[PDB]
Design a protein around this ligand. Structure first.
Ligand SMILES: [Fe+3]
Length: 309
């Protein structure tokens, strides 16, 4: 069977429920393996301890490098069944009423989904590069960001080398600034909560986050986006106001003996049986109260296969 790699107990738990349900409906079998970080899972898959894992774009390049050499086999699909899309938007969310624009963020507080992730780090820092006063290697980019923002929460950052990059995180004790759900400000929802609670002045997340977390349209009106043309616009205008349009998270696997065809068969059948509003028993794209993005993004509605190689 296809062995899936989880990066936490909540994921492992969902993975076992997935296995039990696939069995129940006589569908393709799936097995589970528990690890602790995206990288550990990359390793497991490289040495045949696992077969697949879903990763944010920022980790795709890494996993594709040696020795690992893993490649994407299926991409998450977002939007609606009506208008499917294999991309999402990296946006900058701020509270309505401020006057500062994208070029005036020096000294403020920031909330990021996590270190090395696309919408939360790679795109934002790449955009702010000209304001960072970064000399370049051998200086870590984190040092330049640490002295740009007053304080922030960047899960995964080295609390010892860059103390203020972890200062705004709300994790408890040793789980503070952790690159996992043990840190409340981790991932899209986590970063957005970091803004809502008032810890930060800007959240670097995706366009659908504000609509998922805040159902009441009245509440969404107290948030704005920072557009790269140094203007501010409503949250529903992300298409004319984003930092970048980025490729969706993807399921990766070994380019050699990757069981790519099995993995695709598992996903196509899982999507059809347990996709959006498909089953009251199990949701492939959902999580129990208090959890977010377990295995796959909660905003995903299906999968799209990547071209043969
Ligand atoms: Fe992402």
């Amino acid at each position: 069977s296809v062995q899936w790699c989880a990066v936490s107990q909540p994921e492992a738990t969902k993975c076992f429920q997935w296995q039990r349900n696939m069995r129940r409906v006589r569908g393709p079998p799936v097995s589970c393996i528990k690890r602790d970080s995206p990288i550990q899972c990359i390793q497991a898959i490289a040495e045949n301890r696992a077969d697949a894992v879903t990763l944010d774009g920022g980790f795709i390049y890494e996993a594709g490098l040696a020795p690992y050499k893993l490649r994407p086999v299926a991409a998450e699909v977002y939007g609606t069944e009506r208008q499917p899309r294999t991309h999402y938007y990296a946006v900058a969310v701020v509270k309505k009423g401020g006057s500062f624009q994208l070029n005036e963020l020096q000294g403020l507080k920031s909330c990021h989904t996590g270190l090395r992730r696309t919408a939360g780090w790679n795109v934002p820092i790449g955009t702010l590069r000209p304001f960072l006063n970064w000399t370049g290697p051998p200086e870590p980019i984190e040092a330049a960001v640490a002295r740009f923002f007053s304080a922030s929460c960047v899960p995964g950052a080295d609390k010892g080398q860059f103390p203020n990059l972890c200062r705004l995180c709300a994790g408890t004790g040793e789980n503070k600034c952790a690159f996992s759900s043990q840190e409340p400000y981790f991932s899209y929802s986590g970063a957005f909560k970091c803004l809502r609670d008032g810890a930060g002045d800007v959240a670097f997340i995706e366009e659908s986050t504000v609509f998922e977390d805040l159902s009441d349209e009245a509440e969404r009106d107290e948030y704005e986006l920072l557009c790269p043309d140094n203007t501010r616009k409503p949250v529903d205008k992300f298409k004319d106001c984003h930092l970048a349009r980025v490729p969706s998270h993807a399921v990766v696997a070994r380019s050699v003996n990757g069981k790519e065809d099995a993995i695709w068969n598992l996903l196509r059948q899982a999507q059809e049986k347990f996709g959006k509003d498909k089953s009251p028993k199990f949701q492939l794209f959902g999580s129990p109260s208090g959890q977010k993005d377990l295995l796959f993004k909660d905003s995903a509605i299906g999968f799209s296969r990547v071209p043969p190689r």
